[PDB]
Design a protein around this ligand. Structure first.
Ligand SMILES: OB(O)c1ccc(C(F)(F)F)s1
Ligand SMILES: OB(O)c1ccc(C(F)(F)F)s1
Ligand SMILES: *[B@@](*)([O])C1=[C][C]=C(C(F)(F)F)S1
Ligand SMILES: [Ca+2]
Ligand SMILES: [Ca+2]
Ligand SMILES: [Ca+2]
Ligand SMILES: [Ca+2]
Ligand SMILES: [Ca+2]
Length: 241
């Protein structure tokens, strides 16, 4: 089952943050590519993730963001002072916010939401995970429909909507070098989010890349090798010691 991972290589480090309802395996191939290029990486795993869907509803985005910060702080404790934060999906929103809470050499956002119909993305993301999990449990279609019909929204999903709006409203405070990556065929979040992030950060050093044959979990999809190369080129451009 997926767990946090720590790939120790050279002195340059990347904190890898996964997506909403995702898990560390979604960023592990990126981690391995980075390791082959000499970069250390650490990937936390958010509380309640990689588990039955009700565990997400017992948790909170405030915890998940702290899980992200704990990964940064762990890299520092392990000797890595120079850290780029690279986040997939909701993790990309956490990467932007983390850069306001900790010192980073740069930021990568990959299919991160910002603006638009946030509530739709939250509920569709959760419900898709929940339905797929119940299928994996071997449940029949009626049992799944019945369990899904008993879904009760919790404070978790309202908190997530509020957290996303907070990050949107503070994105003009982001100053560190940034690469914005977006899949054109993302069916979870609106690809125009990438324009919004790019346009509204204060970062003087920024770039954006679009991927025409990819979806939301871009780091496991069919163009992942090009995504990884583009991330690498961005990393190589930064002000490392
Ligand atoms: O420790 B820190 O820099 C945090 C900033 C926001 C946090 C949350 F708990 F509200 F998510 S913790
Ligand atoms: O609305 B508030 O200022 C928030 C505090 C922490 C947030 C999270 F993004 F970590 F979840 S949002
Ligand atoms: B990527 O895994 C995401 C799916 C739904 C998201 C949110 F609702 F947070 F915007 S992010
Ligand atoms: Ca090695
Ligand atoms: Ca150590
Ligand atoms: Ca039945
Ligand atoms: Ca029904
Ligand atoms: Ca500026």
């Amino acid at each position: 089952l997926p767990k946090p991972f720590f790939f120790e290589e050279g002195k340059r480090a990347v904190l890898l943050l996964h997506g909403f309802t995702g898990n560390s395996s979604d960023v592990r191939q990126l981690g391995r590519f980075l390791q082959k290029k000499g970069y250390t990486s650490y990937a936390p795993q958010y509380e309640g993730h990689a588990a039955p869907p009700d565990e997400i509803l017992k948790s909170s985005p405030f915890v998940w963001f702290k899980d992200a910060l704990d990964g940064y702080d762990y890299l520092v404790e392990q000797g890595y002072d120079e850290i780029v934060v690279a986040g997939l999906s909701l993790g990309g929103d956490f990467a932007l916010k983390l850069s306001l809470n900790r010192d980073v050499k740069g930021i990568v956002t990959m299919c991160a939401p910002m603006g638009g119909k946030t509530e739709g993305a939250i509920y569709e993301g959760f419900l898709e995970y929940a339905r797929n999990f119940k299928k994996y449990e071997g449940k029949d279609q009626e049992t799944i429909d019945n369990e899904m019909d008993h879904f009760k929204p919790t404070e978790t999903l309202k908190e997530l909507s509020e957290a996303l709006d907070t990050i949107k409203e503070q994105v003009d405070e982001v100053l560190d070098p940034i690469l914005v990556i977006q899949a054109e065929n993302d069916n979870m979040i609106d690809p125009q989010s990438a324009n919004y992030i790019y346009d509204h950060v204060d970062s003087d050093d920024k770039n954006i890349k679009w991927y025409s044959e990819s979806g939301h979990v871009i780091t496991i999809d069919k163009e992942k090798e090009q995504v990884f190369e583009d991330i690498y080129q961005f990393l190589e451009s930064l002000d490392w010691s």
